[PDB]
Design a protein around this ligand. Structure first.
Ligand SMILES: Nc1cc(=O)[nH]c(=O)n1[C@@H]1O[C@H](COP(=O)(O)O)[C@@H](O)[C@H]1O
Ligand SMILES: Nc1cc(=O)[nH]c(=O)n1[C@@H]1O[C@H](COP(=O)(O)O)[C@@H](O)[C@H]1O
Lengths: 257, 257
């Protein structure tokens, strides 16, 4: 029988980052991750502040920010602490271990310095995780492995997905879960986060495909919905975030039944 | 029958960026791409200028430069034009089409403004290419698809590699070739670039595996070697670049008969 988020926060094998997340999800009654796909720091921070109470997590693509600075990320950390949500940089590390270690720690973005969570493609083999984990371990960071993708023609299926799950199990001191379309692991210490989510049926013009929060949380067994345009494109982003939060939260409650 | 780089430069279906590359390869007798894996702009520029005459291409990870600015890029372009080599940003785009479009055109790096070539993982499905091409085609750029990887445990094998080749075939207005360990396409319009290259047998401590220039160019039929540490860690980077250039060039000549 399915454990609540609060109970999963207490699992013996739980990573500290996953535990903090699960605790705030339970506290705030939200399993919504905002995909803050904007190009302006001011818009990012205004959404983070207004929607902070409604979300468990804010997912960034800082490489799309036109006016990125480390001071912007400092302000984002302040809002994340104030409102209690994790920061997830959707960087999709996908290179050899020696390279991703530098991409995570260094350069202009210094992603490890501010992101609670990052993600990696499993295509390079487990060196991708080993390289990241050397940086993320003393910083008490976590990583999500990309086990499935939402887009048309995704090759992250079958044995590929299985390889991601095995890699996660073998690196559970750093890997806290998955980007996937459905539950892919039966181990409850792993988080499942699912993008390609909208209330309405459809897709976009570049291969994105959508499923509803009820389908993804309720039937497919995932934990958190990641929602970009379904919220960002609304006139009132707060009302939209609330619609998504209630959808995902009630689907989760249903599944506990 | 195998064609020279100079003849391949003239093929009817050749992409203009591949043609430019192939002509300078022939002209300079170099099929060496320097992997300029450094953390400082000064070093990137110093190596680009010193090794420029020995290389057909300089591969960047701009996200590992502690002091990236667009002015550094502007200088790098000046060197590329002076010495005649292409700039290849090894960004490994690997997200949905709508996202990579932004990551290629925008943010702080403005990658499409300066990179002749970029690369993409094929795992998201062909939307990754469609998104990139919306930015890359107007800017007269090319893309390489990652068909194989050099690292231990790579999942880019078998049907995954075949999928990469099909996707390239089908997007030949923008995709000019592959990152691969061997020749994966029989079509001579496509370039094959191979990383994981050193003169000696070995690897690194995070899953890199090395093969020699003779093995990669001569036996495995690839076109260009990509070499980082084999050159940059050497005491004499000029001599090292020349050894790799001579090795790759004579392996090509031999294969050619
Ligand atoms: N990380 C992802 C993995 C994935 O499979 N699909 C996906 O859309 N994403 C990201 O989620 C967000 C989906 O946004 P939207 O389609 O809801 O606007 C975008 O930032 C994508 O880059
Ligand atoms: N793009 C790559 C694809 C790949 O399969 N292997 C690889 O090493 N790379 C890159 O090539 C370079 C290899 O450098 P070195 O091992 O020669 O130092 C690094 O920048 C890697 O990120």
């Amino acid at each position: 029988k399915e454990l609540s988020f609060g109970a999963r926060a207490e699992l013996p094998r739980i990573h500290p980052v996953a535990s903090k997340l699960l605790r705030l999800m339970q506290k705030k009654e939200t399993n919504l991750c905002l995909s803050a796909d904007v190009s302006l720091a001011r818009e990012l921070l205004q959404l983070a502040d207004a929607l902070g109470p409604s979300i468990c997590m804010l997912k960034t693509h800082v490489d799309i920010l036109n006016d990125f600075t480390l001071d912007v990320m400092k302000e984002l950390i302040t809002l994340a602490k104030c409102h209690e949500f994790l920061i997830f940089e959707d960087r999709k590390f996908a290179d050899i271990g020696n390279t991703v270690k530098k991409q995570y720690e260094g350069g202009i973005f210094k992603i490890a310095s501010w992101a609670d969570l990052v993600n990696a493609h499993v295509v390079p083999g487990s060196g991708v995780v080993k390289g990241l984990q050397e940086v993320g371990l003393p910083l008490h960071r976590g990583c999500l492995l990309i086990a499935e993708m939402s887009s048309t023609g995704s090759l992250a299926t079958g044995d590929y997905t299985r390889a991601a799950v095995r890699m996660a199990e073998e690196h559970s001191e750093f890997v806290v879960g998955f980007i996937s379309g459905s539950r892919v692991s039966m181990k409850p210490e792993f988080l499942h986060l699912t993008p390609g989510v909208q209330l309405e049926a459809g897709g976009d013009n570049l291969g994105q495909q959508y499923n509803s929060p009820q389908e993804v949380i309720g039937k497919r067994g995932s934990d958190i919905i990641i929602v970009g345009r379904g919220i960002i494109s609304a006139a009132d982003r707060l009302e939209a975030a609330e619609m998504y939060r209630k959808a995902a939260w009630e689907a989760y409650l249903s599944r506990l039944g």
